[PDB]
Amino acid sequence: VKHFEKVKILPKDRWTQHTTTGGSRACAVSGNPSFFRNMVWLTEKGSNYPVAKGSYNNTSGEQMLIIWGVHHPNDETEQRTLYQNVGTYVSVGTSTLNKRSTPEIATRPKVNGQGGRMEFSWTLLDMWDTINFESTGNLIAPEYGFKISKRGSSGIMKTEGTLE
């Protein structure tokens, strides 16, 4: 891959029923809690966490890379405070794909002062195909997807050096 066009598929503002403005101190930008610029971390709004739904038909004109996370809380407490109801799940599907993942919970060593974890997955969404998310919690959503613009023999070079 030689180029990407970054498309806004599922805009932050389109979830009126959940809290999209949450962040963490592990992503902190100059002391202030932040999060992945390309992701939305959904939490309860008004003590409720209604089913979250989103879909994208691909009008981009080319294939699109899409990524989503699922949050794995440190304890049942965290699960409740964040997503309210337990026994949650995250569902993604397309012409070819199926996943319903459940939030594995384990007490883990603090990493970045964080016992929770986020498991991300990706897929290639074909032209004219459609992606479906629905979840009752622990869903880290894409606000974006990457359309493949230019294609070609290329590579990833591992070096400590700089561009002259």
Partner: antibody, heavy 130, light 111 residues
Framework: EVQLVESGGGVVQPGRSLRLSCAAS????????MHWVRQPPGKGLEWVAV????????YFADSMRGRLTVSRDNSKNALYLQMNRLRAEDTAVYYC???????????????????????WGQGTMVTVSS | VLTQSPSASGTPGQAITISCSGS????????VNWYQQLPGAAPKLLIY???HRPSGVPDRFSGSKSGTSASLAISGLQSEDEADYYC?????????????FGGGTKLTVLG
């Protein structure tokens, strides 16, 4: 070496006003919603106020209506309390405490409500007399 | 305001239990934390969100809540355990949201 140190305490005359600070160290201040709570001298504890990590929202005790300004300077690791029209009741030790969260920071109280106050200062004593 | 037993006492090796009670507003809705203040000094959090203890806290201590009441327990007793004990819970009252503290409890190890 995570700690908070309260200063500004002393004697204040009733009808006048009091100004107090708290110095945070050994941790990231701006990610933590912070607390003011006082213990009258030999009696129990009284919640005073709370200020959000980003300073976006404040909540005051019903006791504190109209007398209270609470502010914070994140870059200075500073907590600021200013209280007007004092009295004998307001005489007490004053405490700056840190509200604990999961990893997570957000606008709703629903998050923090499950937790609370994992670190305190040694306080600063206030006595009200003319 | 919340409410607790006036005072308590027990023996080394003994297990003792202190209670906290309050409105549907606070405890009924929001959960409870427990703080411990040793004499001449400042508070330190004993328990958070009902059952859960923080790090650095011995196992003998542990607690719970049901309905609008909550409870705290020490399974075995050392001289170090002599202090004042406070239940605390968020309210979500009107006027506005607010933290609320129990009056207090003092216990004695009887040394």
């Amino acid at each position: 070496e995570v700690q908070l140190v309260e200063s500004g305490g002393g004697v204040v005359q009733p009808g006048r006003s009091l100004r107090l600070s708290c110095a945070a160290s050994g941790f990231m201040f701006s990610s933590y919603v912070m607390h003011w709570v006082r213990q009258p001298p030999g009696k129990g504890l009284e919640w005073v106020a709370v200020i959000w990590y980003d300073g976006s929202k404040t909540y005051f005790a019903d006791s504190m209506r109209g007398r209270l300004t609470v502010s914070r300077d994140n870059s200075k690791n500073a907590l600021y309390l200013q209280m007007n029209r004092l009295r004998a009741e307001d005489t007490a030790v004053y405490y700056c405490a840190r509200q604990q969260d999961s990893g997570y920071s957000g606008p709703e109280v629903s998050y923090y409500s499950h937790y609370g106050m994992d670190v305190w200062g040694q306080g600063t004593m206030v006595t009200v007399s003319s | 305001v919340l409410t607790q037993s006036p005072s308590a006492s027990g023996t080394p090796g003994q297990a003792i239990t202190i209670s906290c009670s309050g409105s549907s507003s606070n405890i009924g809705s929001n959960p409870v934390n427990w703080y411990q203040q040793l004499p001449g000094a400042a508070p330190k959090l004993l328990i958070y969100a009902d059952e859960h203890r923080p790090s650095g806290v011995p196992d003998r201590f542990s607690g719970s809540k049901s309905g609008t009441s909550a409870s705290l327990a020490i399974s075995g007793l050392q001289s170090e355990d002599e202090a004042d004990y406070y239940c605390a819970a968020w309210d979500d009252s009107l006027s506005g949201p607010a933290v609320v503290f129990g009056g207090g409890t003092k216990l004695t190890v009887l040394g």
